[PDB]
CSV table of C-alpha atoms in Angstrom, one decimal:
chain,number,residue,atom,x,y,z
A,1,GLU,CA,108.1,13.9,28.2
A,2,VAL,CA,108.5,11.9,25.0
A,3,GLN,CA,111.9,12.0,23.6
A,4,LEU,CA,113.9,9.4,21.2
A,5,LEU,CA,117.5,8.1,21.9
A,6,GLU,CA,119.7,6.8,19.1
A,7,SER,CA,123.2,4.8,19.5
A,8,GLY,CA,126.1,3.9,17.1
A,9,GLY,CA,126.9,5.3,13.8
A,10,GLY,CA,130.5,6.6,13.0
A,11,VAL,CA,133.6,5.7,10.9
A,12,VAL,CA,133.2,2.6,9.0
A,13,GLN,CA,134.8,0.9,6.1
A,14,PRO,CA,132.6,0.6,3.2
A,15,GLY,CA,131.2,-2.7,2.1
A,16,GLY,CA,130.8,-4.0,5.8
A,17,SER,CA,128.3,-3.7,8.5
A,18,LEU,CA,127.2,-1.3,11.3
A,19,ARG,CA,124.8,-1.0,14.0
A,20,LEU,CA,122.2,1.8,15.1
A,21,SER,CA,119.8,1.1,18.0
A,22,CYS,CA,116.8,3.4,18.6
A,23,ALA,CA,115.4,3.2,22.1
A,24,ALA,CA,112.3,4.9,23.3
A,25,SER,CA,111.3,6.3,26.8
A,26,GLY,CA,108.0,7.6,27.0
A,27,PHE,CA,105.3,6.4,24.5
A,28,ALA,CA,103.4,3.3,23.7
A,29,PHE,CA,105.7,1.9,21.3
A,30,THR,CA,103.5,-1.3,20.6
A,31,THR,CA,100.9,0.7,19.2
A,32,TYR,CA,102.8,3.5,17.3
A,33,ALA,CA,104.0,3.0,13.9
A,34,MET,CA,107.8,3.1,13.1
A,35,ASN,CA,110.0,4.7,10.1
A,36,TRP,CA,113.3,5.3,8.9
A,37,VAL,CA,115.1,8.3,7.3
A,38,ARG,CA,118.3,9.2,5.6
A,39,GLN,CA,119.5,12.6,5.3
A,40,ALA,CA,122.8,13.7,3.2
A,41,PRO,CA,124.9,16.8,4.3
A,42,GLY,CA,123.9,19.2,1.8
A,43,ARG,CA,120.4,18.0,0.5
A,44,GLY,CA,117.3,17.4,2.3
A,45,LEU,CA,115.8,14.1,3.6
A,46,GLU,CA,115.0,10.5,2.0
A,47,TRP,CA,112.7,7.9,3.5
A,48,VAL,CA,114.3,4.5,3.4
A,49,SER,CA,112.1,2.0,5.5
A,50,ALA,CA,109.0,1.6,7.4
A,51,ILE,CA,107.3,-1.0,9.6
A,52,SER,CA,104.0,-1.8,11.0
A,53,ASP,CA,103.0,-2.9,14.5
A,54,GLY,CA,104.2,-6.3,15.7
A,55,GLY,CA,106.5,-6.7,12.5
A,56,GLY,CA,105.3,-8.5,9.4
A,57,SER,CA,104.7,-5.6,7.3
A,58,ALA,CA,108.3,-4.2,6.2
A,59,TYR,CA,108.8,-1.6,3.4
A,60,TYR,CA,111.9,-0.2,1.6
A,61,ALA,CA,112.6,2.7,-0.7
A,62,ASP,CA,113.9,2.1,-4.4
A,63,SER,CA,117.8,2.1,-3.6
A,64,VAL,CA,117.6,0.0,-0.4
A,65,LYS,CA,115.8,-3.1,-1.2
A,66,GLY,CA,117.8,-5.8,0.4
A,67,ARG,CA,120.9,-3.6,1.0
A,68,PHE,CA,119.3,-2.7,4.6
A,69,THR,CA,117.9,-5.2,7.4
A,70,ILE,CA,115.1,-3.8,9.6
A,71,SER,CA,114.0,-5.4,13.2
A,72,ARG,CA,111.9,-4.6,16.0
A,73,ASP,CA,111.7,-5.7,19.8
A,74,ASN,CA,108.4,-4.7,21.4
A,75,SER,CA,109.5,-6.0,24.9
A,76,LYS,CA,112.5,-3.8,25.6
A,77,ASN,CA,111.2,-0.7,23.4
A,78,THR,CA,114.1,-0.8,20.9
A,79,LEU,CA,114.2,-0.1,17.2
A,80,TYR,CA,117.1,-1.5,15.3
A,81,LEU,CA,118.5,-1.4,11.7
A,82,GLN,CA,120.9,-3.8,10.8
A,83,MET,CA,123.3,-2.7,8.2
A,84,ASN,CA,124.6,-4.5,5.1
A,85,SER,CA,126.8,-3.6,2.1
A,86,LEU,CA,127.7,0.0,2.9
A,87,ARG,CA,128.4,2.4,0.2
A,88,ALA,CA,129.9,6.0,0.2
A,89,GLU,CA,126.8,7.7,-0.9
A,90,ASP,CA,125.1,6.2,2.3
A,91,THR,CA,127.1,8.6,4.4
A,92,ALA,CA,124.1,10.5,5.6
A,93,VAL,CA,122.6,11.5,9.0
A,94,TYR,CA,120.6,8.4,10.2
A,95,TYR,CA,118.1,8.5,12.8
A,96,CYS,CA,114.8,6.8,13.6
A,97,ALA,CA,111.6,9.0,13.6
A,98,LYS,CA,108.1,7.8,14.9
A,99,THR,CA,104.6,8.2,12.9
A,100,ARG,CA,101.3,8.8,14.3
A,101,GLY,CA,99.5,6.4,12.2
A,102,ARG,CA,97.2,3.9,13.9
A,103,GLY,CA,94.1,4.2,12.0
A,104,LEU,CA,93.1,2.0,9.0
A,105,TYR,CA,93.9,4.5,6.3
A,106,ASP,CA,96.4,6.3,8.4
A,107,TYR,CA,99.1,4.8,6.1
A,108,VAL,CA,102.1,3.8,8.5
A,109,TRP,CA,104.8,5.4,5.8
A,110,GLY,CA,102.6,9.0,6.4
A,111,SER,CA,102.3,11.8,9.0
A,112,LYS,CA,105.3,11.6,11.1
A,113,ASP,CA,104.7,14.0,14.1
A,114,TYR,CA,107.9,13.4,16.1
A,115,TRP,CA,111.5,13.1,15.0
A,116,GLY,CA,114.5,11.5,16.8
A,117,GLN,CA,117.5,13.0,18.3
A,118,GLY,CA,120.2,12.4,15.5
A,119,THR,CA,123.4,10.8,14.6
A,120,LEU,CA,125.7,10.9,11.5
A,121,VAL,CA,127.1,7.8,9.9
A,122,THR,CA,130.5,8.1,7.9
A,123,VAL,CA,131.1,5.6,5.3
A,124,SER,CA,134.7,6.3,4.5
B,1,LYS,CA,79.4,-46.3,24.0
B,2,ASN,CA,78.4,-42.8,25.3
B,3,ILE,CA,76.0,-42.5,28.2
B,4,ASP,CA,75.4,-39.6,30.7
B,5,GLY,CA,78.0,-37.4,29.2
B,6,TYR,CA,81.0,-39.8,29.8
B,7,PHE,CA,82.4,-41.5,26.7
B,8,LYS,CA,83.3,-45.4,27.3
B,9,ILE,CA,85.7,-47.5,25.2
B,10,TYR,CA,85.8,-51.4,25.6
B,11,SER,CA,88.5,-54.0,24.0
B,12,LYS,CA,89.9,-57.4,24.0
B,13,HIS,CA,92.9,-58.2,22.0
B,14,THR,CA,93.2,-62.0,21.3
B,15,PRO,CA,95.3,-64.4,18.8
B,16,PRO,CA,85.4,-65.8,14.5
B,17,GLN,CA,84.1,-68.5,16.7
B,18,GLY,CA,85.0,-68.3,20.4
B,19,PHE,CA,83.7,-66.2,23.5
B,20,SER,CA,85.6,-63.2,24.7
B,21,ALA,CA,85.7,-60.8,27.5
B,22,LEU,CA,86.0,-57.4,26.7
B,23,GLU,CA,87.7,-55.2,29.4
B,24,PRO,CA,87.2,-51.4,29.8
B,25,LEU,CA,90.0,-49.1,28.6
B,26,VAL,CA,89.2,-45.6,29.7
B,27,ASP,CA,86.1,-43.5,30.6
B,28,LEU,CA,86.3,-40.0,28.9
B,29,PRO,CA,84.0,-37.3,30.5
B,30,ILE,CA,83.9,-35.4,27.4
B,31,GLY,CA,80.2,-34.5,27.0
B,32,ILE,CA,79.5,-34.3,23.3
B,33,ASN,CA,76.4,-35.1,21.2
B,34,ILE,CA,77.8,-38.1,19.1
B,35,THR,CA,76.6,-39.3,15.7
B,36,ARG,CA,79.2,-40.3,13.1
B,37,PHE,CA,82.2,-42.8,13.4
B,38,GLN,CA,84.3,-42.4,10.2
B,39,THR,CA,87.1,-44.5,10.4
B,40,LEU,CA,90.8,-43.8,9.4
B,41,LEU,CA,93.3,-46.0,7.8
C,1,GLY,CA,92.4,13.9,14.1
C,2,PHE,CA,90.0,16.4,15.4
C,3,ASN,CA,86.8,14.7,16.6
C,4,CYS,CA,88.4,11.2,15.3
C,5,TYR,CA,90.0,9.7,18.3
C,6,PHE,CA,91.9,6.5,18.8
C,7,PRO,CA,89.8,4.7,21.2
C,8,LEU,CA,92.5,3.2,23.3
C,9,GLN,CA,94.5,5.3,25.8
C,10,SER,CA,97.3,4.4,27.9
C,11,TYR,CA,97.8,4.0,31.6
C,12,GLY,CA,101.4,5.4,31.6
C,13,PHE,CA,102.3,3.7,35.0
C,14,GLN,CA,104.8,5.6,37.2
C,15,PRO,CA,106.1,4.3,40.4
C,16,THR,CA,105.9,7.8,41.8
C,17,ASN,CA,102.1,8.1,42.2
C,18,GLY,CA,99.8,7.0,45.0
C,19,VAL,CA,98.4,3.7,45.9
C,20,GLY,CA,95.3,4.6,44.0
C,21,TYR,CA,97.1,5.2,40.8
C,22,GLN,CA,99.3,2.1,41.4
C,23,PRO,CA,99.4,-1.0,38.9
C,24,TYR,CA,97.5,-4.0,40.2
C,25,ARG,CA,97.5,-7.5,38.8
C,26,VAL,CA,93.9,-8.9,39.1
C,27,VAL,CA,93.2,-12.8,38.3
C,28,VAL,CA,89.5,-13.5,37.9
C,29,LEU,CA,88.1,-17.0,38.3
C,30,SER,CA,85.0,-18.1,36.7
C,31,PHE,CA,82.8,-21.2,37.1
C,32,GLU,CA,79.2,-22.1,36.1
C,33,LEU,CA,78.1,-26.0,36.3
C,34,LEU,CA,76.7,-28.9,34.2
C,35,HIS,CA,78.3,-27.9,30.6
C,36,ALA,CA,80.1,-31.4,30.8
C,37,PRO,CA,80.6,-34.1,33.4
C,38,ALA,CA,82.7,-32.5,36.3
C,39,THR,CA,86.4,-32.9,36.3
C,40,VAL,CA,87.9,-30.2,38.5
C,41,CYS,CA,87.7,-30.1,42.4
C,42,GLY,CA,89.9,-30.5,45.6
C,43,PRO,CA,92.0,-33.3,46.7
C,44,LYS,CA,90.7,-36.5,48.3
C,45,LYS,CA,91.9,-36.7,51.8
C,46,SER,CA,92.7,-40.2,52.2
C,47,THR,CA,94.5,-42.0,55.6
C,48,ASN,CA,95.9,-45.2,56.7
D,1,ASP,CA,104.9,9.0,-7.5
D,2,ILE,CA,104.5,13.0,-6.6
D,3,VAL,CA,106.9,15.1,-8.4
D,4,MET,CA,107.4,17.8,-5.9
D,5,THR,CA,108.6,21.3,-6.0
D,6,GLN,CA,109.7,24.0,-3.5
D,7,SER,CA,110.5,27.3,-5.3
D,8,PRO,CA,112.5,29.5,-4.8
D,9,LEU,CA,115.0,27.5,-2.5
D,10,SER,CA,117.2,30.2,-1.3
D,11,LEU,CA,115.1,32.9,0.7
D,12,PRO,CA,117.0,36.1,1.8
D,13,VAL,CA,114.5,37.8,3.7
D,14,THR,CA,115.0,41.1,6.0
D,15,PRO,CA,114.1,40.4,9.5
D,16,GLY,CA,110.9,41.9,10.5
D,17,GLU,CA,109.4,41.4,6.8
D,18,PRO,CA,107.0,38.5,5.9
D,19,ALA,CA,108.2,35.5,3.9
D,20,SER,CA,106.2,33.5,1.4
D,21,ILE,CA,107.0,29.9,1.2
D,22,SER,CA,105.4,27.5,-1.5
D,23,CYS,CA,105.4,23.9,-2.2
D,24,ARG,CA,103.7,22.4,-5.2
D,25,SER,CA,102.0,18.9,-5.7
D,26,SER,CA,101.2,17.0,-9.1
D,27,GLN,CA,98.3,15.2,-7.8
D,28,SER,CA,95.3,16.5,-5.7
D,29,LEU,CA,95.8,16.1,-2.0
D,30,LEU,CA,92.0,17.1,-1.2
D,31,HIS,CA,90.6,13.9,0.0
D,32,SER,CA,86.9,12.7,0.0
D,33,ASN,CA,86.6,13.9,3.6
D,34,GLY,CA,87.2,17.6,2.5
D,35,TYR,CA,90.7,18.0,4.3
D,36,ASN,CA,93.9,18.9,2.9
D,37,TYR,CA,96.8,16.5,3.2
D,38,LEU,CA,100.3,18.1,3.0
D,39,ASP,CA,102.6,19.1,6.2
D,40,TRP,CA,104.8,21.7,6.5
D,41,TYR,CA,108.1,21.5,8.5
D,42,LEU,CA,111.3,23.7,9.7
D,43,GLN,CA,114.7,22.0,10.3
D,44,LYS,CA,116.9,24.0,12.5
D,45,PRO,CA,120.7,23.5,12.0
D,46,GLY,CA,121.7,20.8,14.3
D,47,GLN,CA,118.3,20.4,15.8
D,48,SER,CA,115.7,17.9,14.7
D,49,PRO,CA,112.8,19.0,12.6
D,50,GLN,CA,109.4,19.8,13.8
D,51,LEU,CA,105.9,19.7,12.3
D,52,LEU,CA,104.9,23.4,11.9
D,53,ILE,CA,101.4,22.8,10.2
D,54,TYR,CA,99.6,19.7,9.7
D,55,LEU,CA,96.7,19.4,7.0
D,56,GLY,CA,97.4,23.0,5.8
D,57,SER,CA,95.8,25.0,8.5
D,58,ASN,CA,95.8,24.0,12.2
D,59,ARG,CA,97.8,24.3,15.3
D,60,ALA,CA,100.6,22.0,15.8
D,61,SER,CA,101.8,21.8,19.2
D,62,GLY,CA,104.2,24.7,20.3
D,63,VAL,CA,104.0,26.5,17.1
D,64,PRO,CA,103.5,30.5,17.4
D,65,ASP,CA,100.7,31.9,15.9
D,66,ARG,CA,102.2,34.0,13.2
D,67,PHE,CA,103.1,31.0,11.2
D,68,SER,CA,100.1,30.4,9.0
D,69,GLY,CA,99.7,27.7,6.0
D,70,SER,CA,97.2,28.3,2.9
D,71,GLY,CA,96.2,26.8,-0.2
D,72,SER,CA,93.6,24.2,-1.7
D,73,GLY,CA,94.1,21.3,-4.3
D,74,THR,CA,97.6,21.7,-5.6
D,75,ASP,CA,98.9,25.5,-4.9
D,76,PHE,CA,99.7,25.8,-1.2
D,77,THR,CA,101.5,28.6,0.6
D,78,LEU,CA,103.4,29.2,3.8
D,79,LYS,CA,103.4,32.6,5.2
D,80,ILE,CA,105.2,34.1,8.2
D,81,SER,CA,104.1,37.8,9.3
D,82,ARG,CA,107.1,38.5,11.0
D,83,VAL,CA,110.5,36.9,10.8
D,84,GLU,CA,113.3,37.1,13.3
D,85,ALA,CA,116.6,35.4,14.2
D,86,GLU,CA,114.6,32.5,15.8
D,87,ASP,CA,112.8,31.7,12.1
D,88,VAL,CA,115.9,30.8,10.6
D,89,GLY,CA,115.3,27.2,8.9
D,90,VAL,CA,115.0,25.2,5.8
D,91,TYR,CA,111.1,24.5,4.9
D,92,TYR,CA,110.1,21.3,3.7
D,93,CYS,CA,107.0,19.8,2.5
D,94,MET,CA,105.4,16.0,2.6
D,95,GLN,CA,102.4,14.5,1.6
D,96,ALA,CA,100.3,11.5,3.1
D,97,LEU,CA,98.5,10.1,0.3
D,98,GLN,CA,100.6,7.6,-1.7
D,99,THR,CA,102.9,4.8,-0.4
D,100,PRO,CA,106.4,6.9,-0.6
D,101,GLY,CA,106.4,9.7,1.7
D,102,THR,CA,107.7,12.2,-0.7
D,103,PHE,CA,109.7,15.3,0.9
D,104,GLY,CA,110.5,18.6,-0.6
D,105,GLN,CA,113.9,20.1,-1.7
D,106,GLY,CA,114.2,22.3,1.3
D,107,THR,CA,113.4,26.3,1.4
D,108,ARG,CA,116.4,27.8,3.2
D,109,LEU,CA,115.5,31.0,4.7
D,110,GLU,CA,118.3,33.6,5.3
D,111,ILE,CA,118.6,36.6,7.3
D,112,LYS,CA,119.9,40.0,5.8
């Protein structure tokens, strides 16, 4: 029943912007936490960003502080990731993946049971 | 003045010897126990 | 986790289900008395 | 953070033979409640990864019974009794204690 859809991500000139949109269909997107993942072709994954419920708490990984812009719409059940200052090492498979975490000590960057469908971003 | 729940204000602006007719302004049915009237400059 | 349950649970409203499982908008009016001087009731019916 | 290690990374295993997969942790993942906090995943080629074992021991939804995780404290082990052509995938490991969600380097299982 529950599945995740992505949109956008393709050929882009480096040093610009791009749009990737993550819409959810069958879960309580207000209550669940949300997370962001980068995966290059040829080496495994890397977490880049995470947000708690209702915005407010936004976190970034080490190489991506300020480079990436994150935003959330609780009405239309859409997750956005606004893109700034693209680099050739950012050519990776970008996809939204959700977290369980709803408890006090569940640590929104933690246990992520589902993952989204997937799209590839080519910065070239 | 504050009697039977409602709160009343009376006034008269004039251009202290003399006699004045204070008219009411508005009655506010607030319903508050009232004790202090710290003014504001 | 196991035996540590999130207390809230979703309706998951579906247009397909029956009338007993349909969403319903409920508005509850409330009134008591006497807590202040009275302020609200119906309009005065004035004539010529 | 947690310096994580998955070794060995490339695993040529004959189908039908068991395969042993390990991931190692610098800090103890045993919490005050007695439970293990490290999660085992598989990524198919072109298909999104799945949670295979949460908390080291129990049934994730849809996972067949011959997948089993072991370990305590720092030394954990993932074991499959029988490996087939549907068991090809690259095996990761993630924690849940600290702020950065640290992944593994990925354990590629290969069919000979």
